[PDB]
């Protein structure tokens, strides 16, 4: 039935479809070991943000971010790629939490609208907790277990 659920979600997505960078910014700032670049994967969200000076010089590289995560649902035994909403708590470092570093066991907020789980009052949920449970620096693909 996992094939059926994945096919339904993918077909819904297909039908719906059918119907400056921080690095160059910091280079310009330098022109106009002082630089630290984060070597761990992160998530930004909005396309352009000018960070407060407390975190301005924490550069994060272009490729290392990941927009979507592979979320596995403990019940119904289905795994689907879903967009990452935001990063909430990285137990390794509060600084990593604030930046958005995606380490092992890190809980983020994930959009589960595609899954369509029904909550109390016969109501649907859009955003839920998911624990990143792999080592994305070891394996670029970012995998989480949903919390239901």
């Amino acid at each position: 039935t996992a094939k059926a659920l994945s096919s339904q979600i993918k077909n819904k997505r297909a039908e719906k479809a059918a119907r400056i960078s921080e690095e160059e910014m910091f280079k310009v700032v330098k022109t106009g070991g002082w630089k630290r670049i984060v070597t761990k994967p992160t998530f930004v969200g909005p396309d352009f943000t000018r960070r407060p000076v407390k975190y301005e010089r924490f550069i994060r590289p272009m490729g290392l971010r990941y927009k979507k995560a592979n979320v596995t649902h403990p019940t119904l035994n289905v795994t689907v790629q879903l967009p990452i909403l935001s990063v909430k708590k990285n137990p390794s470092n509060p600084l990593y939490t604030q930046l958005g570093v995606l380490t092992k066991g890190t809980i983020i907020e994930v959009n589960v609208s595609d899954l369509g789980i029904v909550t109390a009052s016969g109501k649907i949920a859009w955003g839920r907790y998911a624990q990143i449970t792999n080592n994305p620096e070891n394996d670029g693909c970012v995998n989480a277990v949903l919390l239901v």
């Binding site: 070597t39 590289p61 272009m62 490729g63 290392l64 080592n135 070891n138 394996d139 670029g140």
Partner: protein, 55 residues
């Protein structure tokens, strides 16, 4: 390539290369059946008579 360019350790490169080669291996593993079909069509199209429609 970007991940390896920003890699920071030997074990980092270890697991990154292993993961990439695993991705290609799994892709071919799913491509298992088209290869058989295309081999069969290749064999017949080779053992196909060649006429000249114009002549």
């Amino acid at each position: 390539v970007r991940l390896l360019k920003y890699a920071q350790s030997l074990y980092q490169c270890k697991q990154l290369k292993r993961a990439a080669l695993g991705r290609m291996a799994t892709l071919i593993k799913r491509l298992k059946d088209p290869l058989i079909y295309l081999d069969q069509v290749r064999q017949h199209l080779a053992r196909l008579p060649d006429i000249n429609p114009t002549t």
